[PDB]
């Protein structure tokens, strides 16, 4: 099976997502992924290629649920409608997926070199982006995206479509 | 004698530079140089103790919000201001963006502290509200997250233009 690479990778993902980073060990992640503890060292050189490895499969997923959404829309309309529930989705269907963003922004923050992550995620989101936006406000739209996902996860009450709607209409104006 | 203060501010300190983790009241009672039973004594748990040096941090920041949108006597020159605000956020305190971020972790993880991010927000709204209405307000708050956040884990941060002109497209009306 060669898929044992991958399972580690999932497994220290989903270790992550549960423990945190700070409980990330190769004994604990070879037991998640079911693989005996030298497999750990056959395929990683070591935590952070690990760590860039996991972090940047995470990283694959949520760029292709903006390919999900985005891809789907005909018009700008569409696309600022596939916004809409792009937020709404990111906010609040998946808590792992909310954990494991959130642990690699603290992670970026702390350490400049995994902000080569970051900056690699933020630029595939605005390709999507720019197939029905211009440049600049694909940029602008991709804060705004950030900002409204983050305020609608940690909310005691998240604010409702409507007003994600309009915001998103209005960085995306351009008259 | 100051130990509760000592307390909270040797939390924050310790999360800042050693993860979250790292919190326990024997580390922390090392910290901030104070009894074990301090710890237990002035708090009910690591949660209530979390939640108020959090609640400190909160309004380190909120304050920062006031002294920015504090002075602006224009719509237009609150737009400057929260621009200006948006660079020193994600420029001046490395510190700031670590406890920011671990708080983002927390109310990650456990809602019961969502209670206090959902606070911060709040408060930062109001001065927001003293320039613009309530909707934009809000919808600005969340700019403000999203481009401070994106100028931050960049590795080159965009330009003050770039963040300006979303100011003013969120604000339009």
Redesign the interface.
């Known amino acids: 099976d060669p898929q044992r690479r991958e399972r580690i990778l999932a497994a220290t993902l989903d270790l992550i997502a549960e423990e945190?980073?700070?409980?990330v060990s190769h004994r604990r992640i070879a037991q998640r992924a079911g693989v005996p503890l030298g497999s750990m060292t056959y395929h990683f050189t070591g935590i952070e290629q690990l760590l860039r490895e996991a972090f940047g499969r995470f990283t694959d997923h949520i760029v292709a649920v903006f390919d999900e959404h985005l891809g789907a829309a005909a018009d700008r309309d569409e696309a600022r409608e596939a916004v809409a529930d792009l937020v709404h989705e990111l906010s609040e269907d998946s808590?792992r997926d909310?954990?494991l963003?959130?642990?690699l922004?603290?992670l970026?923050?702390?350490q400049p070199a995994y902000?080569?992550l970051?900056?690699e995620w933020?630029r595939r989101s605005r390709v999507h982006l720019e197939k029905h936006f211009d440049p600049?406000t694909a940029?602008?739209l991709?804060?705004?995206?950030?900002?409204?996902t983050?305020?609608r996860?940690?909310?005691?009450?998240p604010?409702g479509r409507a007003?994600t709607l309009?915001?998103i209409a209005?960085?995306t104006?351009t008259d």
Do not use: C, P, W
């Open positions: 945190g980073i700070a409980r808590q909310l954990v963003t959130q642990e922004y603290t970026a923050a702390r902000r080569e970051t900056h933020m600049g940029r602008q991709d804060a705004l995206i950030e900002g409204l983050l305020h996860a940690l909310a005691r009450e604010h007003l309009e915001a209005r960085i104006t």
